[PDB]
Symmetry: D2
Subunit: 222 residues, 4 copies
């Protein structure tokens, strides 16, 4: 019962359906790729980018990790961002959270003495949490969970915008836009939490934290 035959038969059928309808569906992407989109999202099994957006092969380059986290000192995620931006010249970066996310739950409730690598990994969710005690405390377990997801989404858009890669791209006039969205596993629909950000002006109007003070910090000293 460790056998893959059923699973290989599903893939075979799918590939045949696809090319029967469009002969160059796969052929036209045999030898290179040029997607317009990068998507950064959760490793959760209910949130499948290509299928929920209906995008075909060669349309969306994807990073996927527990909690949809972005950090300058994570060479895994930073690699997806640098390769898309600097070598494929993508136009749009999608940063996506989901309701009912258990990486955000563990962030609310786990004691940091918890054994294992997952507890190390979701340290980033604790940091967003600890900054928003005023939006979180004394809500129902349910209302706190949905609000944790939204805040993290906002946290990770800022991280993408404040990243060295995306900062160098905007400095050399490359058009690049960043987007904060959220998915509902219960209904399969996407909602837009934050409108499009295409540079320092949009960022300055749409994000809670101050990206400009972040980038130019000694223009606030003496």
């Amino acid at each position: 019962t460790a056998d893959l035959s059923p699973l290989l038969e599903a893939n075979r059928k799918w590939a045949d359906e696809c090319a029967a309808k469009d002969s160059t569906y796969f052929s036209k992407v045999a030898g290179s790729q040029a997607p317009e989109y990068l998507y950064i999202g959760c490793a959760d099994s209910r949130v499948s980018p290509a299928q929920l957006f209906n995008m075909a092969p060669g349309e969306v380059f994807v990073q996927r990790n527990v909690g949809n986290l972005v950090s300058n000192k994570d060479l895994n995620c930073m690699s997806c961002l640098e390769y898309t931006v600097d070598h494929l010249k993508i136009k749009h970066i999608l940063v996506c959270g989901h309701y009912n996310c258990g990486a955000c739950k563990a962030g609310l409730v786990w004691h940091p003495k918890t054994a294992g690598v997952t507890n190390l990994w979701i340290s980033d969710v604790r940091e967003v949490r600890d900054k928003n005690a005023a939006k979180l405390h004394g809500l129902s377990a349910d209302d706190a969970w949905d609000k944790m997801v939204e805040l993290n989404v906002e946290a990770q858009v800022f991280n993408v915008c404040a990243s060295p890669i995306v900062q160098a791209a905007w400095a050399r006039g490359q058009p690049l836009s960043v987007h904060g969205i959220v998915y509902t596993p219960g209904t399969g629909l996407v909602k837009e939490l934050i409108k499009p950000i295409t540079g320092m002006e949009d960022a300055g109007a749409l994000l809670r934290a101050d990206l400009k003070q972040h980038c130019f910090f000694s223009e606030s000293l003496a």
Copy 2:
């Protein structure tokens, strides 16, 4: 223009159908997930695992990084592995490489002096190449590329097998299998490179590196 209306409209259209076909498609995965698979794959825009295996929401938990790499020392990949194995209790790990992989070509032709984070990330790929330098010795460019891909899939499978998370599940008598697969962007077809590995003895029959030696080295001293 970075307008999202077109993408959202495609998600609308997508959700309505899936539901009209089947009323409970989404609502039954409202409040939890219990997938049976973990997929570790490449970040490239042509290899979409839920799409290419035709899997419904909540069927396959996903890690996706430049080059489908697995190291004990990468907390991003290691948490995907710990969460599925230890808490979700999955049964099958899919380790997937792909033909035409730009990460594997970078591993053959870049000089380690190249700037930027992607050059750091693919060091694992240079190490597989060096240990196997002789196998890649007189091949045409295309032939070294296809070989690199396949050698990388075998290594990554040994890495999952040798990981502390996995050695631990085996010693506890957890049922958990590991499978080396490859994908062709040009055809949409999955091929199987290494048959199922369900414990230490399959790993002895199937892998070219010695998993027993790695696990029990110190016994071969006096």
Copy 3:
């Protein structure tokens, strides 16, 4: 010339003396170590902990990195912390910053777009600065630098306190203290910035961030 003879000659001279003073200086630490201290400090060439505390061989176990930084997600620092606490059974952790620290100045004046790995590594330093933006607001260059150093020492001490290794030793009733110190390259003098922390209650009295909140957040939901 890269000849090593001069350096080796200085080690010869050094060893002979220490031994002539005291026959068993070296031979008694031939086959094990049991130090009582762990030092986490900066990599800068002026801050040499065994020298500046005048400690003999086997007295102080050392971590040294650009900016004396501590994150749950850095396996280099975290193993120094786990090995001493869990296996060597140490009693005191020294977390040491220094005046004139180029890492702390880089954290104030670099634009996150700057190339190279040192710019990634010091993100922890930008985050301490941002949370405390107001305290650093109208200071002269020298004054913001000295403040940055001191704020960084407090943060890093909270990081060691909040780590899973340390929370775990405390819950097991292990005696283990944590101490925030600073060093002046110009004088050779150590000053003490935060008094000893020996458990949860000292941490409540001594740190400006709330360690209890961080550990038990989820209790303040309904």
Copy 4:
């Protein structure tokens, strides 16, 4: 007894002795540093660089970690190397192992199912180990341990030489030399395992592995 008074009194006395003998000992390094040496070595409490070499403040910038490891995807160690080479323009890099090293022991004998971050961290020692089964198997526990230390030293010189930083420096004609040495805790003496390496020619003559094939790999393809 968690009290630091005795320890602060030792530092005070030391600093006074030093400046009594030489008035500018500390003063001349109050406002910057310019060391000639970087040292990369073990966090072991018996191996204290500044004291074993008799170097004063401002002479040796130091990285220290469990096992004296160097990896392109360790931002901690890679930071020490990039800062010294590119901003301070050091001339000499010292890579140092020690006999009786317990990071190298754990590498010989631990089962990789072992819980904790230290076991993740010393994965690099397993990789050097697995490549040298022919130098290691059927030696006494003691003889295998000393040989593990020597090999690792060689492993980590190669890693320094093959690093992006040191590769870019040599390409722009910066003089920089790499040195493989070993210390004996039992006798306090240093020994030279590998003679000085100042570029690709020296590396090519003195190192077991092929640095040239490593850097220029497609000049061995067709």
